[PDB]
């Protein structure tokens, strides 16, 4: 099966050499879920344009080293002019909390996934009094995916590296939601030099 | 900007829906560098097939919560049968250490990127005598890209979730190196049921 992968890669690479010879300086940092159904390509860019941080449920803890390190590198060293936090509908991590199945993770040897999803569960609990007005699971799941984009966006825009670059007119931050059913991006939040602060 | 991004996404989504409407569960966890020049699409397989953890210099600390959570979700919940750790040549984080410019990061308000890159710099220092015979930065950078694949691979295969699945013959782990000059994957390491670590 590795030989299948190497074969698939060689085919892909020969085609890629022909199509984009200049590929063989990004302007955007894309932060998205590890979910297999999308990546930075949903932005309608070519390779080389988008530097990507992809993690389970696109979680951006404010005091996390990887977040701070990634924002510093993208903004100060690579000099991206866009940071995009892009969640998506039908997110596994969110569903696991929404359907109260996080409790069951330690039983099946997923104690670290359990701990990792703490932030998502905390959001889900905070949101109980808003969820109750939505009738179907589809609606609740959509709401929490949207809500998670706001949640992580608000932490990114408090980051001092981000505030400095934005204030200087060198950076804009967008919070987007990818709809898996149609491939469309939807605007959740924006933070630019001119947005009210 | 955002207007351009939404238009490019809309156009992209239409082009995807016209070719493959049926695109709207993965077999592979891909772990790669945040680098803009490659992602899971280098494997040459269908979209929705590869769940992806993408971080700066593809660092996998054994005790990192994200590593454990990501492996537990992929192997136990998604039941992927392949874990791929895929580094690449011309890696910025490696070149920062190799060329001794990591020490410059605190001055430019990147002290967290500085701390994040400790593992890469430790590898660089550990390998310094091994690097003497290589007279060009290109050769050194290649050596260190390869070394880093094995370094992160070695930690992944010691994770209990990974070891259980591999010993059960339900998982294979591949260490790969993506050459940015030609789009081709080099095999660095493999771990299977019948292969020693
Ligand atoms: Zn998700
Ligand atoms: Zn890299």
Residue numbers in the entry:
A (entry chain A), B (entry chain B): 17 to 40, 49 to 221
List sentences quoted exactly from the publication behind this structure:
Carbonic anhydrase (CA; EC 4.2.1.1) is a zinc containing enzyme which catalyzes a reversible reaction to form bicarbonate from carbon dioxide and water. Nce103 is an efficient β-CA who shows high CO2 hydrase activity, with a kcat of 9.4 × 105 s-1 and kcat/Km of 9.8 × 107 M-1 s-1. Nce103 contains all conserved residues of the active site in the plant type β-CAs, and a relatively divergent N-terminal region.
The overall structure of Nce103 contains two molecules in an asymmetric unit. The N-terminal arm is composed of two α-helices that extend away from the rest of the molecule, making extensive contacts with the other molecule in the asymmetric unit. In the substrate binding pocket, there is a flat trilobed piece of density, reminiscent of an acetate molecule, which is an analog of the substrate bicarbonate. Compared to that in PSCA (or Can2), the acetate molecule (ACT) in Nce103 is far away from the zinc ion (3.53 vs 2.65 Å). The two tunnels in the homodimer point to the opposite directions towards the surface. It is worth noting that this tunnel is funnel-shaped, widely open toward the solvent but has a narrow gorge (cross section radius ~2.1 Å) in the vicinity of the acetate ion, suggesting that the linear CO2 (with a length of ~3.3 Å) molecule can freely diffuse toward the active sites, consistent with the diffusion-control catalytic mechanism of β-CAs. Nce103ΔN13 shows almost the same activity as the full length Nce103, whereas the activity of Nce103ΔN50 has been completely abolished.
